[PDB]
PDB file of C-alpha atoms in Angstrom:
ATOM      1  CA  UNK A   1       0.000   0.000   0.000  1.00 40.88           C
ATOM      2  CA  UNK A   2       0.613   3.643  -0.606  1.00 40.84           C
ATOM      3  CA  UNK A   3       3.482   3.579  -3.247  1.00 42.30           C
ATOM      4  CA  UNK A   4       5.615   5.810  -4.282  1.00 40.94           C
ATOM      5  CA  UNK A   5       3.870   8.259  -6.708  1.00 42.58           C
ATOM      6  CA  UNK A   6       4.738  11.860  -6.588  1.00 39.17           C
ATOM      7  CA  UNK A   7       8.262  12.081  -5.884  1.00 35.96           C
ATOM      8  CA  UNK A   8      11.375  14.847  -6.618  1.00 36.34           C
ATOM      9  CA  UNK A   9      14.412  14.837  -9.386  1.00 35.38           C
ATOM     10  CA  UNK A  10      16.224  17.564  -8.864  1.00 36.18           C
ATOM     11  CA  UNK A  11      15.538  20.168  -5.975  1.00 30.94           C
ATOM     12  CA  UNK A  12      14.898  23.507  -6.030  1.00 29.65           C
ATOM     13  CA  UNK A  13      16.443  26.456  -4.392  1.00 34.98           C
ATOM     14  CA  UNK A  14      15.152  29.165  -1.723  1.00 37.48           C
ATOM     15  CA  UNK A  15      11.911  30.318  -1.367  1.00 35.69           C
ATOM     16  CA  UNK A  16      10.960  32.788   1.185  1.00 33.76           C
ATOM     17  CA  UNK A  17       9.370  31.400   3.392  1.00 34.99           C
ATOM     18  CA  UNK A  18       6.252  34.305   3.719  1.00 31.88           C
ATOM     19  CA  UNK A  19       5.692  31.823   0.711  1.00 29.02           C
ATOM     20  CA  UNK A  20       5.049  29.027   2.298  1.00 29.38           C
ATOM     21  CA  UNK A  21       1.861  27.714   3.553  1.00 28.74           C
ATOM     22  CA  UNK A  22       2.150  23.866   4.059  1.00 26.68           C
ATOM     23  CA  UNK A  23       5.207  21.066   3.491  1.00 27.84           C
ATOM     24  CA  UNK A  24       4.624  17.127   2.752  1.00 32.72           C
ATOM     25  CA  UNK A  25       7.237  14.286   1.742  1.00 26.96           C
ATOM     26  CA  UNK A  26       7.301  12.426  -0.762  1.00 28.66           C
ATOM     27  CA  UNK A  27       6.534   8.354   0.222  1.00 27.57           C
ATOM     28  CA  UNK A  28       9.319   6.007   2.165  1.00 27.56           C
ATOM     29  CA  UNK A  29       8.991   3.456  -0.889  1.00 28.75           C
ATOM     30  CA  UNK A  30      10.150   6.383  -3.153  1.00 30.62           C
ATOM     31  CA  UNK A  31      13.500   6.404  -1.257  1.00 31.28           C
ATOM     32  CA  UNK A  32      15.836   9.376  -0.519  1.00 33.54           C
ATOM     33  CA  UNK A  33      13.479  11.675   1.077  1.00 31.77           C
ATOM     34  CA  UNK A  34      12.108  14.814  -1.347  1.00 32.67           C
ATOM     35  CA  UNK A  35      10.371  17.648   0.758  1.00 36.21           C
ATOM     36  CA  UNK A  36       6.854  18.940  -1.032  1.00 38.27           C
ATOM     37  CA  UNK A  37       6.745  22.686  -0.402  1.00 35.70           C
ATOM     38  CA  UNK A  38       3.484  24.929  -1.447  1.00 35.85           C
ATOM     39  CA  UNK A  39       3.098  28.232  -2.072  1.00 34.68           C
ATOM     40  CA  UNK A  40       0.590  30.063  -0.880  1.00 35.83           C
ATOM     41  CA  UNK A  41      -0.418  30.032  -4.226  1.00 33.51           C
ATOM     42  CA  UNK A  42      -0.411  26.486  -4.325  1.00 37.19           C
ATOM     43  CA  UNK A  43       2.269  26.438  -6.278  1.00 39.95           C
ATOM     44  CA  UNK A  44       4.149  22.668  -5.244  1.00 40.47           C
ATOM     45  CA  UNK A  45       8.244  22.969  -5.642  1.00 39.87           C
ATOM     46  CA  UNK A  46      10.659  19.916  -4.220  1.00 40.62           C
ATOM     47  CA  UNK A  47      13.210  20.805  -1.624  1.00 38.42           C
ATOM     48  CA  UNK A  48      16.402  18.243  -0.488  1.00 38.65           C
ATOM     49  CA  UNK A  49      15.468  18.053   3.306  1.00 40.41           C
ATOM     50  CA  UNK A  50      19.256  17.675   3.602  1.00 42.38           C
ATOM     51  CA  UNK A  51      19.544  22.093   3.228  1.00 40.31           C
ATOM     52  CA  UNK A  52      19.227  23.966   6.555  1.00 40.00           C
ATOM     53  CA  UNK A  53      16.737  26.344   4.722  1.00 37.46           C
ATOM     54  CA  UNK A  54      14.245  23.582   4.088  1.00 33.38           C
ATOM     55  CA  UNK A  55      14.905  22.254   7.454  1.00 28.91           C
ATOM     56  CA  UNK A  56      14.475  25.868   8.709  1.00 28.26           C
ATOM     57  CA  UNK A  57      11.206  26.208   6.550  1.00 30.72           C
ATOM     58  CA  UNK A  58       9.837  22.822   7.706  1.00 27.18           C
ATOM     59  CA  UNK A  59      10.246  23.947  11.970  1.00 29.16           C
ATOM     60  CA  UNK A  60       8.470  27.237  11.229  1.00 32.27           C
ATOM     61  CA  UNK A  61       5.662  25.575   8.788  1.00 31.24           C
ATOM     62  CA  UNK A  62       5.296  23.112  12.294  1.00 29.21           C
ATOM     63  CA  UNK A  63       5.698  25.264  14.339  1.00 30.79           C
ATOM     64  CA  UNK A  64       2.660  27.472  13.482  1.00 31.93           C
TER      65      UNK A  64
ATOM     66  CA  UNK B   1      12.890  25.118 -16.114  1.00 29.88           C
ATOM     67  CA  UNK B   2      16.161  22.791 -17.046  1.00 31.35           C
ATOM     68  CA  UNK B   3      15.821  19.510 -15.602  1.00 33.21           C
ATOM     69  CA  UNK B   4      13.000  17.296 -13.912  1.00 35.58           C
ATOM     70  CA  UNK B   5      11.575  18.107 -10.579  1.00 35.95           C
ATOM     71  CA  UNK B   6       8.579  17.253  -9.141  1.00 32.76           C
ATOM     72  CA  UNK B   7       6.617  14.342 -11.285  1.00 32.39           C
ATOM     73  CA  UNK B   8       4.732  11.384 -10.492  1.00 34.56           C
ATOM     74  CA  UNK B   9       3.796   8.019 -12.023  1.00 38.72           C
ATOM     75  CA  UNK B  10       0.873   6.384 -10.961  1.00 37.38           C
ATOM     76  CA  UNK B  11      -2.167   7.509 -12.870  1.00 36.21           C
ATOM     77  CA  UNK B  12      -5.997   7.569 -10.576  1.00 31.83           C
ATOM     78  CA  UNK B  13      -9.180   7.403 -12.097  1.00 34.39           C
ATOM     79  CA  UNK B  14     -11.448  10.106 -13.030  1.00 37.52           C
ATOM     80  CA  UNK B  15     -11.656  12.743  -9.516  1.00 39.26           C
ATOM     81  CA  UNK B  16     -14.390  14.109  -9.370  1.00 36.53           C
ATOM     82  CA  UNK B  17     -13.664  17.871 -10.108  1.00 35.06           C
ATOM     83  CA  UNK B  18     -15.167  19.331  -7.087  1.00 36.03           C
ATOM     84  CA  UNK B  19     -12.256  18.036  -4.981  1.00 38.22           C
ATOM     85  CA  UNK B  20      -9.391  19.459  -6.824  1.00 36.25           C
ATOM     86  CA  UNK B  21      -7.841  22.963  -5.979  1.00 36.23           C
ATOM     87  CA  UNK B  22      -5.093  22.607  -8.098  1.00 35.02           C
ATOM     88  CA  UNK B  23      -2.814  20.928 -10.739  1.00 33.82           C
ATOM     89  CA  UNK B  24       0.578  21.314 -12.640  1.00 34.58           C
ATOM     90  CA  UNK B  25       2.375  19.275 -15.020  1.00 34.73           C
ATOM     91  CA  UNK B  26       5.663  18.314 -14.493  1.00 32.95           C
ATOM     92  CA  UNK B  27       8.733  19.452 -16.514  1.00 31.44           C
ATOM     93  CA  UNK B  28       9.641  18.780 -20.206  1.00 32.89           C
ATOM     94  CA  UNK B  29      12.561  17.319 -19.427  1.00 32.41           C
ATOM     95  CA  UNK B  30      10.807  14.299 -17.266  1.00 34.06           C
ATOM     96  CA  UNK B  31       9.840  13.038 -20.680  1.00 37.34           C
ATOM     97  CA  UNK B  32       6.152  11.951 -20.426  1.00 38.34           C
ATOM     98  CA  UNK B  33       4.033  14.544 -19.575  1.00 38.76           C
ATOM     99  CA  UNK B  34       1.912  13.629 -16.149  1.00 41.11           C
ATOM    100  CA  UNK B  35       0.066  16.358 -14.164  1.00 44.41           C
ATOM    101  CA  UNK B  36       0.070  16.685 -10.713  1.00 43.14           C
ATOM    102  CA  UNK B  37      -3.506  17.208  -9.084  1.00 45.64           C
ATOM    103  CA  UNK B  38      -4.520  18.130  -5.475  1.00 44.78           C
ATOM    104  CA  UNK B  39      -7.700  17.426  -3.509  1.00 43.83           C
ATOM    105  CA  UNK B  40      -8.966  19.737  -0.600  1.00 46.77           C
ATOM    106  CA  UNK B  41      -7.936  17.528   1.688  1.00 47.35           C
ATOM    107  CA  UNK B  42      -4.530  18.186   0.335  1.00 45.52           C
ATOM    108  CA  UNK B  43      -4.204  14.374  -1.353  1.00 43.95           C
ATOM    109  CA  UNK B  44      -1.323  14.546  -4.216  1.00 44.49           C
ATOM    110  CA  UNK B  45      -2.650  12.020  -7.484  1.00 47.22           C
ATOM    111  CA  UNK B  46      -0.853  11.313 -10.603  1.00 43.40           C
ATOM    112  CA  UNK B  47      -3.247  12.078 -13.771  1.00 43.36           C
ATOM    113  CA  UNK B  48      -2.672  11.028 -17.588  1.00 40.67           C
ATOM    114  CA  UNK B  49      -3.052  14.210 -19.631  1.00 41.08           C
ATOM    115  CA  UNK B  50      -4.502  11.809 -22.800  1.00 39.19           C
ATOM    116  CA  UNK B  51      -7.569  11.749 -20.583  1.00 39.45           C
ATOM    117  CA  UNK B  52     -10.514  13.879 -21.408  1.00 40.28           C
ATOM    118  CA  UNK B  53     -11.675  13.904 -17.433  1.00 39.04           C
ATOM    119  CA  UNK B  54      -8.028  15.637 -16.770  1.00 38.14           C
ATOM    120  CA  UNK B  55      -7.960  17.850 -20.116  1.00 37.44           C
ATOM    121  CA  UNK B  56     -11.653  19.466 -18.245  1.00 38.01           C
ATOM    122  CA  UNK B  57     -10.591  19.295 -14.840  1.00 37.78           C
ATOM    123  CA  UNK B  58      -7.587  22.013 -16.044  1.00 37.36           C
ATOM    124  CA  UNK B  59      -9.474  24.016 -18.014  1.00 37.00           C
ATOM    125  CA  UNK B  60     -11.784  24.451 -14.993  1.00 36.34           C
ATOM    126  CA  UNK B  61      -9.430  25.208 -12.526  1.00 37.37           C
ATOM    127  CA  UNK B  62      -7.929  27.406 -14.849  1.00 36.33           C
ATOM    128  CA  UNK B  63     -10.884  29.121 -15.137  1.00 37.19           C
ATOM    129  CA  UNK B  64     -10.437  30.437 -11.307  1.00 34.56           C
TER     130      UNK B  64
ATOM    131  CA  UNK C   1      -5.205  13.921  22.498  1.00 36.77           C
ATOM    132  CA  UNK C   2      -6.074  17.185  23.781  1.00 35.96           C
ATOM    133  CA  UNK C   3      -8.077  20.171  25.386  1.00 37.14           C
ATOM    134  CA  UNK C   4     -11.562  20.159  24.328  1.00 37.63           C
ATOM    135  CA  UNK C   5     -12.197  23.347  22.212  1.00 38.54           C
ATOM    136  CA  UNK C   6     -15.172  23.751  19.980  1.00 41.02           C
ATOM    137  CA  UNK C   7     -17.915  21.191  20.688  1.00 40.40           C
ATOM    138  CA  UNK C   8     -22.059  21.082  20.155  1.00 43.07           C
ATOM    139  CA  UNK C   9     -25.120  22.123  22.047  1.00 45.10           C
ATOM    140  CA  UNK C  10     -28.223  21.643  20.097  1.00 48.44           C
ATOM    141  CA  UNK C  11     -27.774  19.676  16.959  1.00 49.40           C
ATOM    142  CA  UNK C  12     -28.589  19.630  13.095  1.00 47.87           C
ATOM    143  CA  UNK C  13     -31.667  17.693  11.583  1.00 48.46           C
ATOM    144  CA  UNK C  14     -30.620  15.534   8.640  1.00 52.06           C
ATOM    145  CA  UNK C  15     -28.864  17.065   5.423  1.00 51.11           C
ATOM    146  CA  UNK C  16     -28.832  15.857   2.238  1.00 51.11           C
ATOM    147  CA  UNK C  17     -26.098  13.603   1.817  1.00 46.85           C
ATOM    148  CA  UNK C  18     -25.437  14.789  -0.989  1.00 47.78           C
ATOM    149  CA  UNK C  19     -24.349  17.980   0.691  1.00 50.84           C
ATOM    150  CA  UNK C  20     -21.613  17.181   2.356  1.00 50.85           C
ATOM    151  CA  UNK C  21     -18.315  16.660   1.637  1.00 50.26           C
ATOM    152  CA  UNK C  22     -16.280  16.205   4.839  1.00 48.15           C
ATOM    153  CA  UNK C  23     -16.714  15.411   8.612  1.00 47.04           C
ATOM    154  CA  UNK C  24     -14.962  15.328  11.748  1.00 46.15           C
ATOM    155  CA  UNK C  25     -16.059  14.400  15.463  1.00 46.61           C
ATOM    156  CA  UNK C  26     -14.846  16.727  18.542  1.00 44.98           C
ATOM    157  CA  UNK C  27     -12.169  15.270  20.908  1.00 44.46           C
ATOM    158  CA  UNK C  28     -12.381  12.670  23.174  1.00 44.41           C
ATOM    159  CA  UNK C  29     -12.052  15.334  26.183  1.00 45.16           C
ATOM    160  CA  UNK C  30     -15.246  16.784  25.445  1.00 44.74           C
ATOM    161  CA  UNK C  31     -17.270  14.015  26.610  1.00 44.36           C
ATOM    162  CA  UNK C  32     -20.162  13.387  24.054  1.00 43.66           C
ATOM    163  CA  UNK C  33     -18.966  12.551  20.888  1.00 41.72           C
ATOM    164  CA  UNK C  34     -20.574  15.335  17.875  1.00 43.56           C
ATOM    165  CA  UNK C  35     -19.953  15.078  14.570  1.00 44.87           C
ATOM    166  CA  UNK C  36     -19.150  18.843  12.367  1.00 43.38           C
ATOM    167  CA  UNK C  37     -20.410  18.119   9.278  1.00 42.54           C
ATOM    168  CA  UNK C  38     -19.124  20.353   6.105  1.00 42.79           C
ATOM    169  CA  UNK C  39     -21.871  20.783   3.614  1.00 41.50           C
ATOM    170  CA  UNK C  40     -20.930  21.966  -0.230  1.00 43.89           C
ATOM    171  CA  UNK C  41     -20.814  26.003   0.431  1.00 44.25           C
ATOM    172  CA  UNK C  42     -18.423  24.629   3.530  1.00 40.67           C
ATOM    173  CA  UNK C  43     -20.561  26.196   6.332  1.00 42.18           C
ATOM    174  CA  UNK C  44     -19.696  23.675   9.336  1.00 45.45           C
ATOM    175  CA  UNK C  45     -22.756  21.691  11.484  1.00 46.96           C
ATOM    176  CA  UNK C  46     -22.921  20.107  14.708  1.00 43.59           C
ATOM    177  CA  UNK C  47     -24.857  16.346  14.279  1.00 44.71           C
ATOM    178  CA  UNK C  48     -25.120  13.737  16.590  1.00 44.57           C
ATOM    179  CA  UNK C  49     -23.670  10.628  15.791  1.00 48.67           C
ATOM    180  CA  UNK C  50     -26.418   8.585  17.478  1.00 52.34           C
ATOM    181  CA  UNK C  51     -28.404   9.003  14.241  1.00 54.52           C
ATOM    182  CA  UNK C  52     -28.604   6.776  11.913  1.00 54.81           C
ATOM    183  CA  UNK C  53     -28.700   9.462   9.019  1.00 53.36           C
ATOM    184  CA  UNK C  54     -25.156  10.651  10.523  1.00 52.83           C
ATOM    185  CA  UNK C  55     -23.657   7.231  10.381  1.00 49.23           C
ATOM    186  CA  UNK C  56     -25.008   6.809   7.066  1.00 51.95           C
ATOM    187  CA  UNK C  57     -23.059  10.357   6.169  1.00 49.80           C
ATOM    188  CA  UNK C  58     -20.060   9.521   7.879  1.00 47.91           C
ATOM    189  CA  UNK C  59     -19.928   6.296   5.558  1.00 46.08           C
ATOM    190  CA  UNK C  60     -21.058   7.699   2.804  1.00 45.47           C
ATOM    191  CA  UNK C  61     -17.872  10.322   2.795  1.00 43.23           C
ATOM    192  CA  UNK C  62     -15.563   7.806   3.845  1.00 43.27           C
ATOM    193  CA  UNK C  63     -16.418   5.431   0.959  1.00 38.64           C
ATOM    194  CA  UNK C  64     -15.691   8.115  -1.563  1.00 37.27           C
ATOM    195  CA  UNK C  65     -12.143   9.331   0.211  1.00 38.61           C
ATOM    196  CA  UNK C  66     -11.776   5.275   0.222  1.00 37.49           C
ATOM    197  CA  UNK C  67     -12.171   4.610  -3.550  1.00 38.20           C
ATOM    198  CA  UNK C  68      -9.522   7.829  -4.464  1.00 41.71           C
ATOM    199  CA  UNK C  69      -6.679   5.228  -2.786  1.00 44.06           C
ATOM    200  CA  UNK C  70      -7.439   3.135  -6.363  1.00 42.81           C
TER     201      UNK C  70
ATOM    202  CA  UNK D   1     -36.098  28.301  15.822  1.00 41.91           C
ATOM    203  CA  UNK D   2     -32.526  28.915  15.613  1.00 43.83           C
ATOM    204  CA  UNK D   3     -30.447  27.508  18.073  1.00 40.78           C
ATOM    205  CA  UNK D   4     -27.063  27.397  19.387  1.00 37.86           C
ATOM    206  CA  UNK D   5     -24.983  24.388  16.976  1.00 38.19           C
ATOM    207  CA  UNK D   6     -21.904  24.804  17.148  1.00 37.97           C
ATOM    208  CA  UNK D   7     -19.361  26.994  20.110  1.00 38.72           C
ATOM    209  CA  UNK D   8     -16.247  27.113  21.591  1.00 38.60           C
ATOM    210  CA  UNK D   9     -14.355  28.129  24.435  1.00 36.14           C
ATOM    211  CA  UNK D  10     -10.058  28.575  24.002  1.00 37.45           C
ATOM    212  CA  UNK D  11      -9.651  31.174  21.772  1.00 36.74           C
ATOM    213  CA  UNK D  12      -6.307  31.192  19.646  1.00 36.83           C
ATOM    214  CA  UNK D  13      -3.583  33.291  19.513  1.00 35.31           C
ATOM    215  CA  UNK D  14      -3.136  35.418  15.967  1.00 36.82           C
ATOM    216  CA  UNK D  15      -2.970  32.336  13.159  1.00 33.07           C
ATOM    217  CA  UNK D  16      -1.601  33.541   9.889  1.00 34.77           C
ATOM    218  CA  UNK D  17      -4.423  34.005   7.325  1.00 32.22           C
ATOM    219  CA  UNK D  18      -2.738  32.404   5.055  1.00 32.99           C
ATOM    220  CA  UNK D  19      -3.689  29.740   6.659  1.00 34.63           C
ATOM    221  CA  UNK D  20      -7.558  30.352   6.785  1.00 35.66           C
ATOM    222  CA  UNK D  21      -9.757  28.822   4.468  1.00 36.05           C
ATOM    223  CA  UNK D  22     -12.910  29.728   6.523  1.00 37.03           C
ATOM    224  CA  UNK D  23     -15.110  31.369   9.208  1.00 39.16           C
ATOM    225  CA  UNK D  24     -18.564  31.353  11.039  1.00 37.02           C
ATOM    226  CA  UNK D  25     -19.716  32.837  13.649  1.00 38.29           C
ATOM    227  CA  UNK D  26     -21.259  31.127  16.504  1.00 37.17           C
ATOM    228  CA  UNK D  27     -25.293  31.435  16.757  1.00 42.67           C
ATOM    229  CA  UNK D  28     -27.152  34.905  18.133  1.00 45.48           C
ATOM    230  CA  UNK D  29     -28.353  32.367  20.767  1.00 43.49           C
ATOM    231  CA  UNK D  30     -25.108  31.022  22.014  1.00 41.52           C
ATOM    232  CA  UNK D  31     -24.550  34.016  23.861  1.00 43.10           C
ATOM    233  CA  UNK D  32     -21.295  35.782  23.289  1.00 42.97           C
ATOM    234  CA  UNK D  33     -19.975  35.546  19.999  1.00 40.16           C
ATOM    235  CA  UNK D  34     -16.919  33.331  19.276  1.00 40.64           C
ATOM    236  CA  UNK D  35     -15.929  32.895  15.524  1.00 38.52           C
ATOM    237  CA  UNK D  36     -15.052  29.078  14.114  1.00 34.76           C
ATOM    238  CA  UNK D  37     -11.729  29.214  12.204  1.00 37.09           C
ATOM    239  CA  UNK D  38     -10.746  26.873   9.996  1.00 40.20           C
ATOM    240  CA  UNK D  39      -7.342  26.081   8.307  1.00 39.15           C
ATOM    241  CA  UNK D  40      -6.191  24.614   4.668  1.00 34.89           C
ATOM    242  CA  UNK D  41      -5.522  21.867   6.928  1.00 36.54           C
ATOM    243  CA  UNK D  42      -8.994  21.971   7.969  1.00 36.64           C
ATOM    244  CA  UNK D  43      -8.552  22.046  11.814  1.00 33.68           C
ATOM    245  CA  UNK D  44     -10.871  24.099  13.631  1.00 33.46           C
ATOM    246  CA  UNK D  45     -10.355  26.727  16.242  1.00 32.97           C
ATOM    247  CA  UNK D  46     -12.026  29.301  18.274  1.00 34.50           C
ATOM    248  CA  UNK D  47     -11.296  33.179  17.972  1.00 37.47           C
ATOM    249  CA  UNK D  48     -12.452  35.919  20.019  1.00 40.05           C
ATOM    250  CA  UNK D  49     -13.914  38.352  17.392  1.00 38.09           C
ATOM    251  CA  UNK D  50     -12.891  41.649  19.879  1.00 36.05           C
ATOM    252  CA  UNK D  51      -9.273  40.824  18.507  1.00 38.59           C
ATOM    253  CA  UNK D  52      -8.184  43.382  15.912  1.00 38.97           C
ATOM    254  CA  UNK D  53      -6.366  39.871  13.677  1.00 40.40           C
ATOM    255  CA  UNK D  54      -9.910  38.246  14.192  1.00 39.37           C
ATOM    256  CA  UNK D  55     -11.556  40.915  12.496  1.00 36.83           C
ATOM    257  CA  UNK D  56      -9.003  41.375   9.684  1.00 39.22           C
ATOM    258  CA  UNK D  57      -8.978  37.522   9.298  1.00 38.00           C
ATOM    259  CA  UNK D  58     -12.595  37.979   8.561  1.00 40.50           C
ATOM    260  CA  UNK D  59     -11.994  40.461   6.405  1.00 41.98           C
ATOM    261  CA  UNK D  60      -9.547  38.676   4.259  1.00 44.37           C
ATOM    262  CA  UNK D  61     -11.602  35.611   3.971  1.00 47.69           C
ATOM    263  CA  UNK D  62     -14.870  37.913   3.084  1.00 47.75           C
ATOM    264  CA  UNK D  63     -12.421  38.927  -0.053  1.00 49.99           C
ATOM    265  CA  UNK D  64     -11.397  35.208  -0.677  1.00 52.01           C
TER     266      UNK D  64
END
């Protein structure tokens, strides 16, 4: 159950994180871990949980 | 933009539209093209663009 | 799980199922159990689970969120 | 004929509006008023409408 579907390539880069309303990851089957970040906009961008920014954008989104 | 980021692989059937808030397509350079759609609940599918049911639920939420 | 902060005092007669498109129940602090049902135009209602009609409501949205998994 | 449905007691400290997707007042017949917040995430919380955020949050959401 619950596969791998939506998954991450290559990450992105900063994004402010005003931007930000909500993070998910990507599945354990998929693998290495990919961060789902959406804008505000709804706009859905990968982000390599490995960077201190997307670890810094993931305690704020939580801790909210 | 240059290489593949977010993408997915594992195509639902026909959402109902009322559901969805969103979609995107992935990048060019992931090959097949495979949009990305979100529920309300925030649920990430898979869709397969060839499908008429996908082709409307864009042009909908496009027209938003 | 936690403090119990909105709950239900009088509750809503039966909606069209067809209305709804999401429910939750309050917490397990607040005593009672109530269902907050979310109709269409996603104004929230208080229903008691005790009814029939709200079991049938509850199933009838978890069947659909069920069949999305395929 | 109308009577109070749904209330609530903790109120919440400022929550981003990005964050709303919703609001309703409690019922005339509850008594004092309390407004029912409710976030993309679709938890619910109580806000007390004298709060200047409360009011703007309403605001927002009357324009969304």
């Amino acid at each position: 159950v619950t596969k791998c579907n939506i998954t991450c390539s290559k990450m992105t880069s900063k994004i402010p994180v005003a931007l930000l309303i909500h993070y998910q990851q990507n599945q354990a089957s998929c693998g290495k871990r990919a961060i789902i970040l959406e804008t505000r906009q709804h706009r859905l961008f990968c982000a390599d949980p490995k960077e201190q920014w997307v670890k810094d954008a993931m305690q704020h989104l939580d801790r909210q």
